[PDB]
Amino acid sequence: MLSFCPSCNNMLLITSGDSGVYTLACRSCPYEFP
């Protein structure tokens, strides 16, 4: 869904965040976004 992770263009992934927050962050790359 246009989920490009810049500097790798790989993917994004809704990850289980702190206090249950719905953060999105991919593997194989140190990246995060609200």
């Binding site: 810049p6 500097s7 790798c8 263009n9 790989n10 962050a25 593997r27 194989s28 790359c29 140190p30 990246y31 995060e32 976004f33």
Partner: protein, 183 residues
């Protein structure tokens, strides 16, 4: 009517061209910048290019996942294989002159994930440490048996060769005027 004479004064310098598949050329009609190379890395006889780049800090970084998983920070390498072809000279343009030099290879830069490749090396190391459970004499080449060659033999020779950490500079007026003074 008008005519712009070109001549070919370039030798002795096997200059390469890269292609960043990650960063765009222009951003909202505005031309972008190139990121600053920390150091370069070149493998002769296999023509690889492990260009290192830094990625920016905590604000868009998420170090708490980067530190605890692979313990490798602030370094994003990207592998480029040197591919050769004919034609395709490189031209810098003078006022009513245009001066050519041959391009030796064109390598294409893909994001080489180094740290999570190596995160399974200690994981493979710890496999046989939790499960430790356990003579080199010559033989003869037989003419009814074959040996590996071609594609997979070139990967056996491209992992073990000399590292070179390149002193990356940005000069190039020495390369310019040396070409200008030669006809």
């Amino acid at each position: 009517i008008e005519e712009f004479p070109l001549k070919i004064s370039g030798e002795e310098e096997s200059l390469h061209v890269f292609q960043y598949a990650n960063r765009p050329r222009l951003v909202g009609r505005k031309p972008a910048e190139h990121p600053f190379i920390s150091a370069a890395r070149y493998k002769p006889k296999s023509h690889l290019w492990e260009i290192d780049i830094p990625l920016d800090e905590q604000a868009f970084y998420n170090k708490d996942k980067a530190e605890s998983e692979w313990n490798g920070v602030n370094v994003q390498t990207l592998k480029g294989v040197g591919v050769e072809n004919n034609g395709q000279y490189a031209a810098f343009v003078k006022d009513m002159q245009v001066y050519l030099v041959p391009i030796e290879r064109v390598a294409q830069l893909k994001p080489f994930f180094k740290y999570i490749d190596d995160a399974n090396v200690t994981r493979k190391q710890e496999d046989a440490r939790r499960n430790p459970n356990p003579m080199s004499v010559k033989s003869v080449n037989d003419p009814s048996q074959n040996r590996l060659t071609g594609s997979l033999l070139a990967h056996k020779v491209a992992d073990e060769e000399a590292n070179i950490e390149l002193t990356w500079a940005e000069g190039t007026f020495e390369q310019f005027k040396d070409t200008i003074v030669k006809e």
